[PDB]
Symmetry: C3
Subunit: 604 residues, 3 copies
Amino acid sequence: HFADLVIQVIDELKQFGVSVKTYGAKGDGVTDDIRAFEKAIESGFPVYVPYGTFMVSRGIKLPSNTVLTGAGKRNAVIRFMDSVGRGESLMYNENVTTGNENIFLSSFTLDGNNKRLGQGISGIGGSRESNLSIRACHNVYIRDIEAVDCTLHGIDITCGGLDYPYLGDGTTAPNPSENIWIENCEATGFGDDGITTHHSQYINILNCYSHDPRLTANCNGFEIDDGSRHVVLSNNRSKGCYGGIEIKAHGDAPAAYNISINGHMSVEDVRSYNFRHIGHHAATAPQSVSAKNIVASNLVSIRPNNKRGFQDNATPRVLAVSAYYGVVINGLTGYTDDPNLLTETVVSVQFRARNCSLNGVVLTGFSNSENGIYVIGGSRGGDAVNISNVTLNNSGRYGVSIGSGIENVSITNISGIGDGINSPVALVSTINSNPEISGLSSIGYPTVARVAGTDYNDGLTLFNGAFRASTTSSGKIHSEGFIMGSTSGCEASVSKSGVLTSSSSKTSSERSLIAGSSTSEAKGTYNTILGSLGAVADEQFAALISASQSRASGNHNLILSSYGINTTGSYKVNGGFEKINWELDSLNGRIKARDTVTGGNTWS
Amino acid sequence: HFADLVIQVIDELKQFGVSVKTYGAKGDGVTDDIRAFEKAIESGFPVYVPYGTFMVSRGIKLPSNTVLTGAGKRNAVIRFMDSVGRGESLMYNENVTTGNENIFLSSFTLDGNNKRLGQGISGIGGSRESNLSIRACHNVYIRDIEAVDCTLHGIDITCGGLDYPYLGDGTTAPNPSENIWIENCEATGFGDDGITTHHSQYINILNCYSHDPRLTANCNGFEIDDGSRHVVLSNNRSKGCYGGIEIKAHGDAPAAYNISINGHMSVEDVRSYNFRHIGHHAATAPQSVSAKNIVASNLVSIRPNNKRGFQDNATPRVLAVSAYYGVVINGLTGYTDDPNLLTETVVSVQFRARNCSLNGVVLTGFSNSENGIYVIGGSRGGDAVNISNVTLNNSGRYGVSIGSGIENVSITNISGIGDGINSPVALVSTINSNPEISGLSSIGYPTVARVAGTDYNDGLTLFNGAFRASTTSSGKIHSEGFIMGSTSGCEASVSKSGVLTSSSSKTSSERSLIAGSSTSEAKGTYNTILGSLGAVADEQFAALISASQSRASGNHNLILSSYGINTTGSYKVNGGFEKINWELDSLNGRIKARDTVTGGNTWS
Amino acid sequence: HFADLVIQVIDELKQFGVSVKTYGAKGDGVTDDIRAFEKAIESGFPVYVPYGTFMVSRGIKLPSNTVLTGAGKRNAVIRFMDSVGRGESLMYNENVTTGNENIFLSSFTLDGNNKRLGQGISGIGGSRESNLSIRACHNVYIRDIEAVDCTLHGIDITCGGLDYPYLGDGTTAPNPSENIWIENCEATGFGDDGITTHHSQYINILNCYSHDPRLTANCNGFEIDDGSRHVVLSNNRSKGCYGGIEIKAHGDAPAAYNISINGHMSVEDVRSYNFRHIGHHAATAPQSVSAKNIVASNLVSIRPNNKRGFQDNATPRVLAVSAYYGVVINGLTGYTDDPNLLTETVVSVQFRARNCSLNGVVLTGFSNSENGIYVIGGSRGGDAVNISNVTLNNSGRYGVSIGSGIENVSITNISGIGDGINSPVALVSTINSNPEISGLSSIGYPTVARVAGTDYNDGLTLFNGAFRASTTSSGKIHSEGFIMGSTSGCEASVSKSGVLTSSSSKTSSERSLIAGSSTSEAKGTYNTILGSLGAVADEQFAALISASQSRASGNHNLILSSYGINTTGSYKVNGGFEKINWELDSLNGRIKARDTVTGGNTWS
Ligand code: NA
Ligand code: NA
Ligand code: NA
Ligand code: NA
Ligand code: NA
Ligand code: NA
């Protein structure tokens, strides 16, 4: 009775706000405390949850402008009673359809008591039965919450409605959640995903730990799902899930877009980083209009495996990209100490993934996998895959393998050690004949580069398109042409034409070369102009060597050592000075001089 | 009276430190609590602020070695009374000029009650009237503070003095703040900037949210301003400001330098990332000596726009760099769903920005903008701009546009889709004739690359300087020269000289080519040496083909199919074996054999 | 007595858990409170430490499932008494050998009272005498702990046992700690390292500050040491230590592996980022089998110096890599305002470091250092060093210097300003003759590139291996060969062979060139084929120009302007049409026509 009076004084002090115990909460692990929570929450004061295990017979419903703070994880614990039926998340905002505003949740454990339902049980339908569900809310801060024994998800951010909407690709669901911060939270023992987002935007997930789902379906640590956009994940860890971070959508929904991963650590997940859009992977169906923009950096993947048998024994991956446009990966380290856990492909880019770049990758220990990096395309216009600055330490019988449908690949600065690999084949392999490649270095791979069946073991540099080097300006260069070592005014405008070491010299001659020349022009076919000034070759097989101010216009007509002559004869070699002075006539077997032809000569 | 005694016992327990209520604070939203705060703060104990709205009639002044902790944002709230005049920040350190030490502020709302002044009002002068001002302090930790309705800034870190110092570029202001940590803070409804730094160093800003200024001037989410240096920003979000993160200085001050952005999300700002130095942009004034070193990664920009009319309707940008030297951008995603919000340039590098690199960029949705990336230079020595691994999804009529004053550009692995763009022009365009380019891929752009007026639609690779390929060592190669497919000892030392497929062969001959040769040398002009051994061409237009141990020293003198001859005749083709044996004399029209000249021959 | 009763009511309320004061703690800076701590900790309740300085005469031992929370740093302070002897860390888990589970520590200062021992004193042996030692524990969360005046380390995570195990390289010590989170902690005035890990895995270190060791040995801010693996460090700061972040091992231990640095700021450390494996640096001893996989991004280094004389006056570094395989650095900014602090090398990659990549580097102010970036190798197979997108502002007499033992280097997009440097030499220098280089830009360096003694000041592009440009497919190209500007079916299969501007043309001729041709083949040596169709040159020095369906099989035998002839003569020029029709015989000095040889000709 005296104690009651002292407590009344303490309560009135409101040192933390109002304690739930002030409204009758026992926190004794037995008594139903729901009414105390509802009373405290409806009072308008910030609510404090002190030490205890606070049992509730139904979900805790949160109105707008709620502050709910506990004494800390495994200190303040909130828990469903054994007798609770189906349908409710443990904690969720009051207005399920159009949402609430300004909800600040901190420092307690949510224990969903899934075990009360027996084993192997997940959510009854849609977004129902997570530990924490936030639906259509603006301005929600979720901090230092531990979510355990969850029926559906640990923490779910979604749009209005108990069900998830399936409106088709290219849509935006009404009533998104917006401005959400999830920090220093933990999710484990969940039936679907640890921390997940749907149909919501402007979300930061920082320093959280999601691990060990109860089930072996599509059970992910962090699941950026249907309708998500404008999300940052940073410095989180996942462990022992299917996907570490999954970014996706189901088929009848828009894929998450514009997602940033600013560092992550994945420990013994199946597919550490798994980006996909279900239903938008086949070549015979349209591209996803939603699956776009993922920038992911400083990614760690450790011992990816499928010991638990997730997803019908799906094969492990450090990284798997499918469906998405515009995925940029920078700074990826994959490490394993057990060669038998992942034996197919370490990193895959396939199934309509397009315009993807990988830079700064180290893959170590995958000595019984078939491929380190494996890429497949669809011969799509404007597509590209860039792979640079990759080092492989006993990872992949094929280090970097490029398959069919890839027309635009850049592969630069790849190195590999294959001495510890079970039956290595090639550091780099391509199906397509025209990859761009440079900077390959290897030891212990029998072949370094296999390009469309041809092996290169002593280094290679391959570039595509019109080529120009050591020339500061030029006119047009054909894609099967080149200009090198020249000054201004040159052009090599047709297939198989080129200019070397020249000035103001142009070729429009299919199968031709101009070298060492000035103000010269080739415009027939099979033309050669060498060491000449003001030379023109304008007929098939016409040529000039060491000639000035001369034009060879004959079929197979070659001019040598001449100035100021124009020749038109077929199969003739000519020379002269201001006029034709000799001829070797291959056609008729005649030799002609303007002056004399003589034997018995000396040169003294 | 009994309650008073119970409270005395509670107070004496000091469970949090000392409560301000112990010193007479009411926290009732009405009573002036300033004396209680001052008494508690001067006591030497850590101070606790429990639930309440604590009104104050003047600024709360903080001495050295202060710990001030509240019950949490929107729980413990500190607020200026309606009657407060002008001149004071709500909370600031005691020693305004030489500063204080060891101040730890946590878990409360600061409400500046700017509305008491009417609307449209900002700070009265210098650093006066922010919610929180830290001046010349060392070791300050600011955590979980919400700053609302601010007259000047939300949170300001500055040097000693109420005014900001304007000492000119290249200076360091006395009495900096140093070792500051700002974490999980929010700033909104401010008159200038949300969270800002001036003239201070060693600062980490982490996981903060700054949004919605009251005014439409230079009102930024995060403003790294005048005199700042050695600052890290990471995992913050800005929304609805002018600049998301601005890094700059005014004209009469040194620019912030050595600044790191380790991830950021910008939502509906005008210029998400805005780096500049006012007064140091013109070509006719000197470069900033202070604007240097920005490394920014994992940057997100969403729907940049100027609907609010900030800064006289400044045009929106995902990124704008001006004035700065040494800006490195890696991993940038810009996304919009409204083509009409930003119609000028998505990313700009101009106005004395120099030595800037962009890698790993995805820009999506900017289908009515003129330029995706736009770069302008000043023909500065040692300057460079590197653009690599960029993909554009309906963003920019010109995808990557390089303007005047750029002598050194590297543009690699750019891809674009232009089918959804309003009147697309070219994926890549340059004014300068000598960009370095490779790895372009596009669909829906009428032109792929336009290089100084010339179009390339079928791929291109352009490199600058002396060129060498498939040759492990060589002597000198001129910048208008090349050596390919050769072994050691070759050189191509003058303009328009080159060596192919040779060994120990050298040319110093302007307009020349040596191919398929050994120990050969060209040293005249217009020289050709092919398939030869020990061949020398040392006069204008001299040449040798299929010759051994021979020297052509005549003007337009060609040697064919020979061994061991030296010729000097003008306009002569010669052949021989240990001595000259025939001549075709183009000059005089003579044909000469040492032995016989005959007709009627057969070859059997 | 009444106060005692009120307190009993308060205690029973358990608002924070149980206060240590409930078990008799005074927290008066004098009374020994150890028994109160032990009693509170053994009770099974979460333990709260309120305001006070809580003295203890022996270490606080932590059992499994402990929650220990204070009122905050410099609020709740825990401190060794002056009389405490040697051997114990201030706070550590109970089971030193096989460890404990689920320990959550938050919000207090640990004061090790090292000063009680006099000055210059460090730990008595192994892991003994840190402020906080965690040995063989799973699931430990360490948050907002300030560790001061530490005898050994501030915070140490290690395997079971008081000693550290020295089991040799390539081992894994029993009983690791696992799943550790260290956040918002501070360590200073320590004898060895601030925050350190040994023989443990799955660790995140976030937003911590480690600075100012008492001693000048190997005293690091963050020390990822012997046996560590799978660690992320992000957004920490180090100041005034030897290493900012050190990743290493001692000689008789395995190096830390698979470590990620997701942003860091190093202030006035000696070697900001220092990666090494003691005993595994010499060329005459084996490579580390453990030192692998470091990905480090967004790294800041400020004024590195050795004013304090750490480590026998070790020379300062922004970055030093030795021993490690697979180090990826992206986004590094080094800045100094004092040229005299670091005068040797800014960034070094040496001493068995291999397969390292640096991208996006800005180094500013190091105007009296010998080298900006300095790299040395060991001629190791599969090795590579990639340096790209680097800008230097008055940093390094040699900007990028590559030394001996490097066979595989890629150096791209390097720029430098050297006008402010004391006696600059070259932007780029290499010892090896075959670096791959492009995109160099400089001002104020007397030489731009010095490649094995040869200077290049006007730009250079150098590539290695078989070369191909403007050709979409080909057969084999030798590493001393090339194909350019050609269509399918070509090959240049031997040393010094090449094909230009041709179709279906092949050379296996050492020292050869085919240009402007179709279906042609060179298979002797010193062969030239130009502007020809169906041409074969199959003898030494054989050649064809403007020839169709012809074969030159003679020694030094040239065919000109011909169709359908096969020649075999030595030192002969021939022409013909379906049969040989003329010959110039260099061997014997004969001129032969099938028909007539005549003088007195005109061409009209
Ligand atoms: Na899932
Ligand atoms: Na899902
Ligand atoms: Na501003
Ligand atoms: Na400002
Ligand atoms: Na150490
Ligand atoms: Na150590």
